[PDB]
């Protein structure tokens, strides 16, 4: 539930998603157990900073107002979408979040 | 891992989805445990049949070549997307699929 995430703090970041949903639950379960030390939070309003992730690529989406995390394409647009967790090594600032998995 | 699904066969498919991941999980979870009988399979390419479902609405998506099913917005477009299961009372024909979750 309580997570201190690495929020992207570069003007542009190099990132990547995954091609299929099965590669994503494979890859993101390791992240989820390692507190996402490898991912960066990108706010919905800052999506343009992300390079290397196509609309078809799977990332971790966050929705809510308390956030619910789930695997989704980067191009998907549900209401209440607040941001994504995206594999990246960008520079970051640590921020506390409340996340449901 | 071996499912009989109601494949939509009407000219127009009146249907609906769900506005948040949390709400979608609840319904589809009950729909899954009742064999998806309240749902219709809509092949990719026939989404213009569907009335009542917004791109932001959550439905069940099915991707693969053997399918894997997961909750996703109706508008999401991963590679190998084969179709959706969407709550609908449309006329149907029964067909055989292979599905994991």
Residue numbers in the entry:
A (entry chain B), B (entry chain A): 3 to 67, 69 to 104
The paper states:
The crystal structures of SADS-CoV nsp1 and FIPV nsp1 reveal that their monomers contain six antiparallel β-strands and two α-helices. The overall structure of α-CoVs nsp1 shared the same fold, with a characteristic six-stranded β-barrel formed by β1 relative to β6, β2 relative to β5, and β3 relative to β4.
The SADS-CoV nsp1 and FIPV nsp1 structures were refined to 2.1- and 1.8-Å resolutions, respectively. Their space groups are P212121 and C121, respectively. Each asymmetric unit of SADS-CoV nsp1 and the FIPV nap1 structures contained two and four subunits, respectively. With the exception of the regions encompassing amino acids 105 to 110 of SADS-CoV nsp1 and 106 to 110 of FIPV nsp1, all the residues of both nsp1 proteins can be built using the final models. Furthermore, the structures of α-CoV 1A nsp1s and α-CoV 1B nsp1s also exhibit obvious differences in some loops, especially those located at residues 52 to 59 in SADS-CoV nsp1. Specifically, SADS-CoV nsp1 and PEDV nsp1 have a wider distribution of negative charges on the surface than FIPV nsp1 and TGEV nsp1.
